Design a protein around this ligand. Structure first.
Ligand SMILES: O=c1[nH]c(=O)c2[nH]c(=O)[nH]c2[nH]1
Length: 434
C-alpha cells in the first residue's frame, strides 16, 4: 500500500504541476527606455509610468507601450489619462518578466500573454483531454496485456515524456509531450486504483481514504518541491526522474455496459453523473489557478493540503457515522457557499479569501470521497459500468474546467461565480437521491 501511496503522491506533483510550471509573473512590453542602458535613468517608477500606459487595476498595462516617452503625464500640473490610445503599441519589440519569484516559466518562455492568453487554459484543457484519452484507452490495454505490463509501460512513458517536456524547445512539442504524459498519468491512475480496490479490500472505504490522503500529501509534496527550485525545467526534471527509478519494480525486480442506463436507475445514474461532473469541473478549475485565489501560492498549496487531510478524515468519519446522502449534500453545499463567499469577499481581504478557497478545495475533496463511496452502493453488482461512467463524466467536466477561465475577460468574478454555483446545484440534485 505504501508503494502505491508514494506512486499517487508523485502523480499529484506530476498532475497539479501546472500551478507552478505555468505560473504567470508580472510582465510588460519591452521598452527602450526601461530595458536598454543607453536611455535608462528621473525616478524609475516615473519612467515606467511614462513609457507604458496604465492598465487594469491601476497598474502599468501588461501589454502596451507608447510610441515615444510621454513626458506630458509626468508633470503634476496636467491631468492624467490625457494621452490618446492611438499612440500605443502592443509589445512590438517583445516582453519582459519579473524573475523575483519564478526564474523561468512556460508563460515567460513562449509569451503566453494577452494576444495568446488562451494558450495556458488551452494547455490545461489539452492535458485533461489527454487524461480522458488515457483513461479510455487503459481499459482494453490493461485487460489484454496484463495489469503489471501496463503499469511498467505507463511508468516508462511518464519518465520519457517528463524528461522530454523538461527540454521542450517549442510550444506545440511541449503540448504534445504533456498530452502523452497525461495519457500515461491517467493510465497509471486507473491501474493503481483497480490494483488497490481489487487486492486490498470490507475495508474499501479505508483503502480509498488512504489512497486519496496520499494524493493530498502530494499537494504538500509539490508545494515543498516548487518552493525550492522555482525553475520549470528543473522542476519537471526532478518531478519526472523518480518514475524511471520506480520502473525498476518491473516484473517484481526481474521475477526476484452503459446501454442499460435508461431502463435502469435513471434518476440515480443522472444524479451521480451530475455530481461527478460537478466535482471534476470545480476541482480542476480551482486547483489549477491558485495564483488568483490567494496572495501566496506556496502557502496556499500547503494550507490546502494540511486542511484537506483532516477535512477528508472528518468526511470519512461522518460517512461512517451517518448516511452517504446527507454528508454529500452538506459537503457540496459547504463548498458551494465557500466559493461563493470567496468570489464575493473583496480582494483586499487576502487572508480571508485564501481561507475560503482552502475551505472550498477541501469541501470538493470531501464530496469526491462521498461520491466515490456512493457509486459502489447506488447500483447493484450487475450495474456497478456505472462507476466508470461517473469517473469518465468527472474527467469530462475537468476538461471543460480550465476552459471557463477564458470567461475572465468579461469579468474576474464570473469563473469563480460558476465554480461556486455548480456545487450548489450539485448538492441540490444529490438531495433527491434515494
Ligand atoms: O483523490 C483524487 N484527487 C483528484 O484530483 C482526482 N482526479 C481524478 O481523476 N481522480 C482523483 N482522485
Amino acid at each position: 500500500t505504501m508503494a502505491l501511496m508514494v506512486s499517487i503522491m508523485w502523480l499529484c506533483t506530476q498532475s497539479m504541476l501546472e500551478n507552478f510550471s505555468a505560473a504567470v509573473p508580472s510582465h510588460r512590453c519591452w521598452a527602450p527606455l526601461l530595458d536598454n542602458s543607453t536611455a535608462q535613468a528621473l525616478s524609475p517608477e516615473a519612467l515606467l509610468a511614462i513609457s507604458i500606459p496604465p492598465g487594469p487595476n491601476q497598474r502599468p498595462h501588461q501589454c502596451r507601450r507608447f510610441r515615444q516617452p510621454q513626458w506630458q503625464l509626468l508633470d503634476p500640473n496636467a491631468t492624467a489619462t490625457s494621452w490618446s490610445e492611438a499612440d500605443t503599441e502592443p509589445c512590438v519589440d517583445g516582453w519582459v518578466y519579473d524573475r523575483s519569484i519564478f526564474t523561468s516559466t512556460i508563460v515567460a518562455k513562449w509569451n503566453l500573454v494577452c494576444d495568446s492568453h488562451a494558450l495556458k487554459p488551452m494547455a490545461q484543457s489539452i492535458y485533461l483531454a489527454g487524461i480522458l484519452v488515457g483513461a479510455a484507452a487503459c481499459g482494453p490495454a490493461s485487460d489484454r496485456f496484463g495489469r503489471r505490463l501496463v503499469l511498467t509501460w505507463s511508468y516508462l512513458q511518464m519518465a520519457v515524456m517528463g524528461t522530454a517536456a523538461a527540454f521542450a524547445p517549442a510550444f506545440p512539442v511541449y503540448c504534445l509531450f504533456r498530452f502523452l504524459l497525461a495519457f500515461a498519468v491517467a493510465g497509471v491512475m486507473m491501474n493503481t486504483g483497480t490494483l488497490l480496490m481489487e487486492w486490498t479490500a470490507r475495508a474499501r472505504p479505508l483503502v480509498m481514504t488512504l489512497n486519496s490522503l496520499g494524493f493530498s500529501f502530494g499537494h504538500g509534496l509539490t508545494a515543498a518541491v516548487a518552493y525550492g527550485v522555482r525553475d520549470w525545467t528543473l522542476l519537471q526534471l526532478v518531478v519526472s526522474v523518480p518514475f524511471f527509478l520506480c520502473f525498476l519494480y518491473s516484473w517484481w525486480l526481474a521475477e526476484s455496459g452503459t446501454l442499460l442506463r435508461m431502463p435502469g436507475l435513471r434518476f440515480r445514474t443522472c444524479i451521480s453523473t451530475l455530481c461527478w461532473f460537478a466535482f471534476g469541473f470545480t476541482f480542476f478549475g480551482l486547483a489549477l489557478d491558485l495564483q488568483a485565489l490567494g496572495s501566496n501560492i506556496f502557502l496556499l498549496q500547503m494550507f490546502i493540503g494540511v486542511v484537506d487531510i483532516p477535512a477528508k478524515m472528518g468526511a470519512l468519519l461522518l460517512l461512517s457515522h451517518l448516511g452517504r446522502r446527507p454528508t454529500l449534500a452538506a459537503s457540496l453545499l459547504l463548498a458551494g457557499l465557500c466559493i461563493l463567499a470567496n468570489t464575493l469577499v473583496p480582494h483586499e481581504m487576502g487572508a480571508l479569501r485564501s481561507a475560503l478557497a482552502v475551505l472550498g478545495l477541501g469541501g470538493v475533496g470531501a464530496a469526491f470521497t462521498c461520491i466515490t463511496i456512493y457509486s459502489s452502493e447506488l447500483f447493484p453488482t450487475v450495474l456497478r459500468t456505472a462507476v466508470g461512467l461517473g469517473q469518465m463524466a468527472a474527467r469530462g467536466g475537468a476538461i471543460l474546467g480550465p476552459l471557463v477561465r477564458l470567461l475572465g475577460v468579461h469579468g474576474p468574478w464570473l469563473p469563480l461565480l460558476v465554480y461556486g454555483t455548480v456545487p450548489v446545484l450539485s448538492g441540490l440534485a444529490a438531495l433527491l437521491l434515494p
